[model samples]
Target chain A: TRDQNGTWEMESNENFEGYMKALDIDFATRKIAVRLTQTLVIDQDGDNFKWKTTSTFRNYDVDFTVGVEFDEYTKSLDNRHVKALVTWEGDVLVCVQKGEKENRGWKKWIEGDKLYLELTCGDQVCRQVFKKK
Target chain B: TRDQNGTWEMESNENFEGYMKALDIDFATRKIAVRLTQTLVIDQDGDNFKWKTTSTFRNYDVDFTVGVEFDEYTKSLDNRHVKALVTWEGDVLVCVQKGEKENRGWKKWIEGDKLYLELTCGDQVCRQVFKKK
Candidate 1:
C-alpha cells in the first residue's frame, strides 16, 4: 500500500496560467492563484481517502473511495460539474473527471520526499511539486 | 494545545439548506449537497492547521495558522472571496470570514467522540454533527 499521509508544501509550479486559462478562470482569480504557494494534505485509510489543497488564496478539498464514481462540482476552480472517479495505477493515483472540457483530470504520485500533482484541462496541463513538511 | 487530528464523518445536519441559500447557491448544487454525507479531516501541527470538508458531491479545503489572516476563495460552496482568520476560543476553533456578506464563518469543536461544526452566513446558521470514524 502506498503511504500518502503528510503535509506537503508547494515547491514548484509549471504552466499554471495556461491550465487556468483553459478552465476560463477570470484574470483576477488566476493572477492571485498563480502567485500563491499551495499546500496539500492527504489522509489515506485503506481505499478511503481525503485530499486537500490549501493556499493563502484558496482551498480545495475532496474525499473519495477507490473505484467509486461520484458527482463533483468544481466550486471556485472552474465552476463546472463532473463525474469523477479515482483508481490506482500501481503507486500512482489517477483521477478521470468527465465534464464539459476535454481531457480534464488530475494525477498524483510521490517520489522520494516530494509529491507531484498534475492538473489537466482541455489541452493544458499544470504540474505542481510539493515537498513534505 | 488541542489535537484535532483525525477523520470525522457527518451524522446529522441542521438548516443546511437555509445556510446555502444565504450564500446564494443555486438550486442544483444545494439539492445535491443536502443529501450527501460529509467527512471532515483535520491536520494540526502546533499553530498551523489544514482542514478539509469532503463529500461525494463536492469538497472544501482550507489551511491557516492561528492568529493569521489570509485571503480565501470559497470555491464550490458559495463562490465567494473572503479574508479568513482562525483563532482558538478555548478549545473551539472559530473562523471569521470577512467578505461581501455579513457575519460569515464557521466554528468547530469536539465533544467526546463527536465533532460539531456550525456554519454561519448572514442570519442563517447551520449546525452539523459528525462522529469519529
Candidate 2:
C-alpha cells in the first residue's frame, strides 16, 4: 500500500517531558512543558497525508502529498524556518531543505525495530533513534 | 567601523576539488568549477559590506551591513531561496537561515592557521577548511 511510500501510523505520541527529552528541550523549559500533552494526528489520503504535532504550549504542522513540494516550520523549536521537499528514495523518505545554513537538514528512514532521524544544525549534528512500538 | 562586528577579508577561498567533492555536486559540475578562480571582494563599512564572488560561469553579489537581515538565493549550488539574518556571535559571524530544512545553517570561525566554514543542509554535512593566503 501507499505506493511504497511506507505507511507510518502514529502509535503513541507524548509531549512535555518526552518531547523536551527528545529534543534536549533544556531544563528551564521542561517545567512548563511537562504540564502539556502533545498529540500527533495524521490524516491519510491515498499516498498523501497531513502530519500535525499539537500541544497546549505550541503546535507544529506539515501538509505533504507525496512527491509534492511543501513548507515546514519548527515553530518554537528555535523558531527557524526551512524549505523542504520530500521524495522517495526507494522506500525511504528523503527530504532536502534549502536555507541559511550550509549542508543543514534531516533524513528519515524506518527499519524493522526503529525509526531513524538525522538532525543537523551548523557544526553540531545529532542523531535521534526512535524505537517503534 | 563595523559597529564592533568583525570584518572578513577573503584570506583564501576555494571550491572543489576538496571537501566539496563529497557533497555529490556531480562530475561535470566539478570539472567546470575546478578550473575557475573564485575571487571574493569586500567593501566594508560600519556593520555592513558588499561581498561579491566573480568567476567566468557565475557572478554572485550580496549587499549586507552588520546587524541587518537580508535575503540570499543560492542560485546554482542548491537553487533555494532563504531568509538569512547574519549576527555577530562574538568575533565570529553567525547566520541563521529561515527556509525549508531543520537545524540548517553555517558558522564561520577563524583561527591562527586557517579559516573554517561549516555547511549543513539536511542529513548531509560537509565542512570546508581554508588556509589563509
Q: Which candidate number would show the highest lDDT if scored against the true structure? A: 1
lDDT of 1 by residue, B1-133 (tens): 1333455554545555654454455666566556654455556454344568544332466555667788888773446789988777877768899987777788866566455567676656655554443
Residue-level lDDT tens digits of model 1 in A13-68: 55656544543456655655565544555565543445685453234765566577
Off by over 4 Å in 1: A1-58, B1-133
DockQ of each: 0.04, 0.01
| Residue B90 miss distance in model 1 (angstroms) | 30
**Lowest lDDT block of 10, candidate 1 chain A:** A1-10
| Among all candidates shown, the one with the greatest DockQ | 1
Best by TM-score: 1
Q: Pairs clashing in candidate 1?
A: A75-B75, A75-B76, A76-B75
Q: What is the DockQ score of candidate 1, to 2 decimals?
A: 0.04
Which lDDT tens digits does candidate 2 get at residues B1-133? 1111122221223332443344443455455445433333334343233334333332243445546667778543344678877666765656777776565677655554444556555544545444432
